[PDB]
């Protein structure tokens, strides 16, 4: 076996040829960013939501 896969047809585990131990693959932390603000006529401050 060279590398693994999952249900979603994506790469999950990769074995390097240098050393017999295998390495998992998990992508970088991704997600939407949302803003929490009141009306501009009332205040000016904002809140950042991830």
């Amino acid at each position: 076996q060279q590398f693994g896969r999952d249900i979603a047809d994506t790469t999950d585990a990769v074995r390097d040829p240098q050393t017999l131990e295998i390495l998992d693959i998990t992508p970088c932390s991704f997600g939407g960013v949302s803003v929490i603000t009141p009306g501009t006529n009332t205040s000016n401050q904002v809140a950042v939501l991830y």
Binding site: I7, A8, D9, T10
Partner: protein
Amino acid sequence: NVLYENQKLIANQFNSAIGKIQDSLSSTPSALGKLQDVVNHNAQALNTLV
């Protein structure tokens, strides 16, 4: 006037119906078709995009 002359029988029948429906909600495995179907449709629609 018919309720107060048969209150014990009505209460016993209500308790028996509650027990029977509590047994039947777990005995039948196909009684939860709609929620399982819609969550399976959502999961399949999410999986087919990937």
